[PDB]
């Protein structure tokens, strides 16, 4: 995150750190708990990941330093990538991780609500991007979960800012016209959480952008509302 502040423990209890084990253990991407055995993240996170066996999901974490060999995690049973996914910039940058065990809900780890079909119309004035990613384009993963409040931008406004790209209605953009506050390397897969009627909703999944926090370059997120049917399809299968 660029231009953000340390989060307070228990602030984003749906936020997880998705780690890889091969070659060595390291943070890979962000993600969100949406069900007791379901993580919603970005499809681009699994580039070259040939097995879910190398994945570890850590919930209830503020500081990466809390993660050691003795730290409990959730193993990944299955990686479900949207079958229309080619790349982040073309969209369908959405993936589900089915966990081997059930997440026990509490004040440190709980699910974020998905946007409702009626919520396709609503505005959202309280949106926040979270993560352990870089604070500037060339940097390193941060120990403490950072947060930044970001204003939503119209698809029309986002399209002017991305000449040579196609900003679809399955994408949602966020950013300040002057930049300064944004997501950056290591935040992707993570949430864009918006509060509406005292309830937090997973409006977006951190997907792509040109650099980080640059002026007239909004962050591009997967518009979760447009994938509610697909999430229900893959998680509610008979």
């Amino acid at each position: 995150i660029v231009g953000g502040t340390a989060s307070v423990r228990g602030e984003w209890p749906w936020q997880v750190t998705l780690h890889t084990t091969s070659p060595t253990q390291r943070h890979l991407c962000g993600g969100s708990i949406i069900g007791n055995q379901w993580i919603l993240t970005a499809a681009h996170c699994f580039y070259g990941v040939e097995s879910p066996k190398i994945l570890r999901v850590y919930s209830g974490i503020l500081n990466q330093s809390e993660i050691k060999e003795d730290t409990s995690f959730f193993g990944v049973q299955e990686i479900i990538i949207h079958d229309q996914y080619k790349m982040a910039e073309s969209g369908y940058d959405i993936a589900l991780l089915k966990l081997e065990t059930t997440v026990g809900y509490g004040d440190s780890q709980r699910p974020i609500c998905l946007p409702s079909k009626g919520d396709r119309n609503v505005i959202y004035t309280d949106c926040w991007v979270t993560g352990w990613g870089y604070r500037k384009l060339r940097d390193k993963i941060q120990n403490t979960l950072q947060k930044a409040k970001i204003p939503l931008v119209t698809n029309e406004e986002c399209q002017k800012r991305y000449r040579g790209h196609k900003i679809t209605h399955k994408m949602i953009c966020a950013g300040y016209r002057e930049g300064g506050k944004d997501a950056c390397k290591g935040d992707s897969g993570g949430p864009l959480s918006c509060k509406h009627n005292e309830v937090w909703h997973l409006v977006g999944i951190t997907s792509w952008g040109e650099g980080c926090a640059q002026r007239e370059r909004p962050g591009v997120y997967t518009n979760v509302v447009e994938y509610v049917d697909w999430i229900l399809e893959k998680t509610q299968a008979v």
């Binding site: 949406i34 069900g35 007791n36 379901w38 059930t102 699910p111 609500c113 998905l114 946007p115 409702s116 919520d119 309830v199 509610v228 999430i231 229900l232 998680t235 509610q236």
Partner: peptide, 7 residues
């Protein structure tokens, strides 16, 4: 919660 995912 508004949208329900089976446990």
């Amino acid at each position: 919660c508004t949208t329900k995912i089976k446990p």
